[PDB]
Design a protein around this ligand. Structure first.
Ligand code: HEM
Ligand code: HEM
Ligand SMILES: Nc1ccc2ccc(CNc3cccc(F)c3)cc2n1
Ligand SMILES: Nc1ccc2ccc(CNc3cccc(F)c3)cc2n1
Ligand SMILES: C[C@H](O)[C@H](O)[C@H]1CNc2nc(N)[nH]c(=O)c2N1
Ligand SMILES: C[C@H](O)[C@H](O)[C@H]1CNc2nc(N)[nH]c(=O)c2N1
Ligand SMILES: [Zn+2]
Lengths: 407, 411
């Protein structure tokens, strides 16, 4: 019941008690592990609020206090009365920082307590949402010196008045299906680049067109807004050796801002809560650039390197994969835009695990996601045993709006 | 109950029913996943159902389920158990069990080869000397002058746990590790503790960077004995790089035959504590883990220095770069010497095909994603994007405690 994790590279053993506070489920059973599966009323609400408020008041060392008991009382009243309740700004901030702290798939959590929270709960319209999002983007971008932020739109009420950002990230590149049959731009966003035009967007049919925001306020039809280009920081990608690299025509945006997730605090559901940090270099160079179902530029880059692409045994994909990732990092760094390499970030995570085990008694972590998509075993996390479990507050996945929107 | 796995690269969805025939536990619960934990004397009481379960499996495979031959064999085994408290497998059953243990090995990317396993029945063995002979023959057969063949040699099953056959080596062929007084290590740091035991057991160590360890062999629960594998039987490959001529001068070589000797084979409740098995290497095993792990030979530094890389900032990816060339060198050297080896791209690609075939013909293929995905270049192999289900089927290979920790010394 009191669990240990061993690091096989350093013999360091940590003991995990935190997992016993776990409330949600994993998909796994004693008979089968689903560790590699990508996505496995008034009554419900007060215990949920209670547990949250209890951990909140314990964190400020006022567990079992007047204010504590009073707040529980006050929240208990408001639920009984209104069937929902509203968070204090203090609780909202604590809640958000903690959903990030608890995101078992996030390698970047060492920075969890340094989140800028923007309370956008007074928002009523898509234009309103657009305004808050532009403010978020400008604030987080910070001329290249990136700062983590989240902007929180009103909480779900009856699932009819939902606030939703339809973009999966605030900033993504368009992708267009061709008569040629191939794909121009980012193939991940073909369907979204369609719905944008299917709702009125005028695509400049390019390779790296910044997609328009599709914003849904109070469960209404979504509206298209173009983010001011001067707010979208992009990095042209060159290699610190191969000057043919610039010719490839590649760039990427500085601000990774995940916008499709659902933030759950004390039972309350924030369906629109776009958040942003900064990139680990592999996200762009390994996944965004070299994934088969993405920009898949491996074959081209290898050719330009004149590699023996005849046999897989030459490891030409590996060679190029490395150079590509060297270039992403080099471009960002030279352009003074925040980025972290997978070595630095994984090392930071181990230190953070150490810290969390020490000061909190554990740190939930999904090894399948924490290990970088390249050079896995030359990073410390590879040899780190991890325990995966779900704590609240949390970020959860949620259905794509176009499958759900009661139009 | 049906279960589905999706490949996010190809959108291929598959349906698992095989997980239903799963008995053993995972370590996971509804409230915690222990998917990245490395490792999470038996009565007749529970022996009959394990025997029966196995024999039912066996007679279905040969399409004789419920036949008279099936029934009599159940009766035969039942009788032998209540009379003797254990039982003996037929040759046919032993061969079936060993192959299926491999087929069920959820952490093995090489399972496409599962049905082509050479089973050596060493159950008539009685002494360490006999064990040495059987192993010598295994090594020679499997090695096959560089054209490697999968084999497993099976020594007598456990009885009371006091007469165990064990091979004390973790692999039949492995290099010595020596701790120096200055704290540096000479050779393979993975094998320091085992090297010490050997030395204490009377081994005269050459103390070089690539000394082949002697076999330490335990028969019938007696104290282990030291044997030197004939060097002519140990096939080795000098590591060079196709473009880098300074690479030969690094002084590296590796042995051709990966032959794991410390696992336990379970078949119908029977426990085979000595069952060394061998296949061939995937390049990354040597090139990534054996050479470049910090806790191993750890040559990244020296290789990177010789390539003149920027080693001042980690963001130069010098480690990543040096890692690739080292793995290129391993593949190149092995192929150049006509010693069987497989690259991680070929191996994972073949595994996806095997896995798909298994879902179709068997209703599933248990797979441990954490182990199946190669330790470099993960997402540029098809297994990375492949959802998998992990569950335990028998027959199976299991871990077991190191013998020096449990052994009662005779003297
Ligand atoms: C500040 C620097 C940050 C870095 C370097 C970072 C890094 C990463 C990486 C590499 C992943 C793997 C995702 C993938 O490969 O597709 C990830 C996932 C994730 N991150 Fe972080 N992150 C950062 C900030 C944040 C912030 C500010 C939040 C929330 C407020 C957050 C929450 C999450 C969540 C919930 C996931 C998993 C999402 C899912 O399940 O799909 N991260 N992060
Ligand atoms: C024939 C070519 C083979 C290849 C290329 C291959 C490949 C691999 C690799 C790369 C691993 C991961 C081990 C690590 O990274 O440390 C593994 C694990 C494993 N292999 Fe295979 N293998 C082969 C044959 C065999 C055979 C013949 C058997 C048994 C008869 C076997 C049984 C296992 C088992 C039980 C594991 C899991 C070990 C553990 O849990 O520690 N393999 N294999
Ligand atoms: N660098 C970062 C920072 C935060 C992240 C949060 C989530 C994810 C997961 N990727 C993701 C999830 C949903 C939509 C999407 F477009 C990407 C990656 C991150 N990557
Ligand atoms: N190429 C192969 C073939 C079979 C294998 C079987 C097991 C393992 C796991 N590694 C291992 C297990 C026990 C001792 C040891 F030294 C290595 C790797 C394999 N690697
Ligand atoms: C913690 C984790 O279980 C451990 O480091 C694993 C990771 N995956 C692995 N995968 C393979 N193939 N071989 C290994 O030794 C390991 N080590
Ligand atoms: C099948 C598997 O769950 C899927 O490909 C995962 C593997 N690990 C990952 N890890 C990260 N960081 N991001 C991902 O998208 C994925 N994809
Ligand atoms: Zn699990």
């Amino acid at each position: 019941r009191f669990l240990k994790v061993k690091n096989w590279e350093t013999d360091v053993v940590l003991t995990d008690t935190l997992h016993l506070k776990s409330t949600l489920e994993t998909g796994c059973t004693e008979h089968i592990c689903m560790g590699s599966i990508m996505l496995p009323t008034k009554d419900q609400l007060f215990p949920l609020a209670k547990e949250f408020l209890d951990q909140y008041y314990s964190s400020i060392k006022r567990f079992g206090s007047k204010a504590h008991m009073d707040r529980l009382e006050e929240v208990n009243k408001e639920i009984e009365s209104t069937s929902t309740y509203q968070l204090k700004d203090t609780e909202l901030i604590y809640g958000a920082k903690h959903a990030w702290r608890n995101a078992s798939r996030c390698v970047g959590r060492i920075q969890w307590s340094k989140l800028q929270v923007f309370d956008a709960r007074d928002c009523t319209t898509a234009h309103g949402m657009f305004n808050y999002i532009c403010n978020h983007v400008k604030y987080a971008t910070n001329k290249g010196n990136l700062r983590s932020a989240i902007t929180i739109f009103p909480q779900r009420t009856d699932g009819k008045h939902d606030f939703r950002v339809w973009n999966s990230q605030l900033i993504r590149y368009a992708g267009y299906k061709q008569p040629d049959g191939s794909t121009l731009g980012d193939p991940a966003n073909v369907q979204f680049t369609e719905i944008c035009i299917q709702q009125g967007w005028k695509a400049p049919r390019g390779r790296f067109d910044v997609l328009p925001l599709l914003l849904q306020a109070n469960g209404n039809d979504p509206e298209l807004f173009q983010i001011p280009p001067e707010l979208v920081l992009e990095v042209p990608i060159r290699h610190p050796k191969f000057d043919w690299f610039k010719d490839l025509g590649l760039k990427w945006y500085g601000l990774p801002a995940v916008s499709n997730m659902l933030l759950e605090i004390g039972g309350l559901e924030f369906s629109a809560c776009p958040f942003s940090g900064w990139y680990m270099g592999t996200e762009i160079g390994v996944r965004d650039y070299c994934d088969n179902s993405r920009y898949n530029i491996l074959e081209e880059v290898a050719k330009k390197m004149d590699l023996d692409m005849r046999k897989t045994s030459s490891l030409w994909k590996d060679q190029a994969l490395v150079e590509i990732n060297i270039a992403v990092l080099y471009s960002f760094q030279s352009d003074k835009v925040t980025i972290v390499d997978h070595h630095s970030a994984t090392e930071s995570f181990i230190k953070h695990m150490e810290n969390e085990y020490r000061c909190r008694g554990g740190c939930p972590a999904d090894w399948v996601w924490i290990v970088p998509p390249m050079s896995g075993s030359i990073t410390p996390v590879f040899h780190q045993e991890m325990l995966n479990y779900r704590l609240t507050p949390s970020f959860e996945y949620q259905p794509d709006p176009w499958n759900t929107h009661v139009w």
